[PDB]
């Protein structure tokens, strides 16, 4: 039963048109945050009930649902070049002794 449920759930998520990504530029007391929605221009938009002006932090990257621009989740997640350089690099090998002389 659960497998039939699972395949269906996968189906329903994908539907969602839009779905973006902004960054909280600053916070105001009006149950809103000014977001520079990154692919778009700017939007001053109200918070979703799930995550509020309290929780939000300035310069935190955020997910957004559809063309509504309601808050989904906060993303810690940041694209930076240093991080990208680390992935090429991987876990640095190797014991002191081998170097040792």
């Amino acid at each position: 039963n659960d497998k039939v449920r699972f395949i269906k759930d996968e189906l329903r998520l994908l539907q969602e048109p839009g779905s973006y990504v902004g960054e909280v530029i600053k916070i105001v007391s009006d149950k809103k945050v000014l977001v520079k929605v990154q692919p778009e221009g700017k939007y001053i938009v109200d918070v979703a009930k799930d995550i509020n002006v309290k929780d939000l932090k300035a310069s935190q990257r955020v997910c957004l649902r559809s063309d509504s621009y309601m808050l989904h989740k906060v993303l810690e997640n940041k694209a930076d070049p240093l991080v990208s350089l680390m992935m090429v690099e991987k876990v640095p090998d190797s014991t002191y002794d081998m170097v040792g002389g």
Binding site: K26, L34, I44, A58, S59, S68
Partner: protein, 87 residues
């Protein structure tokens, strides 16, 4: 308080797409450029005083029909916050 509140929810459907006030013509209309290449000859409707608005101000416009629903911006950019390091 109750006054402010009731009104604000009604008028403001969201999201609200910001503009820049380029000029005023005295007849409670303004000419603004939106982020879209077409600019829009808008009504000033409700809230913010006509006097208080001086050209070069950044402004909140309502998404269904573009109208001056107020200001809370004052040409806020992230660049100013970055620089600002009173800390």
């Amino acid at each position: 308080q109750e006054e402010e509140k009731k009104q604000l929810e009604e008028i403001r459907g969201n999201p609200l797409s910001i503009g820049t006030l380029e000029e005023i013509i005295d007849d409670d209309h303004a000419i603004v450029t939106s982020p879209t290449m077409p600019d829009y000859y808008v009504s000033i409707l409700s809230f913010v005083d006509k006097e208080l608005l001086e050209p070069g101000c950044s402004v909140l416009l309502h998404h269904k029909t573009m109208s001056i629903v107020g200001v809370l911006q004052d040409d806020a950019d992230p660049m100013v916050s970055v620089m600002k390091m009173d800390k």
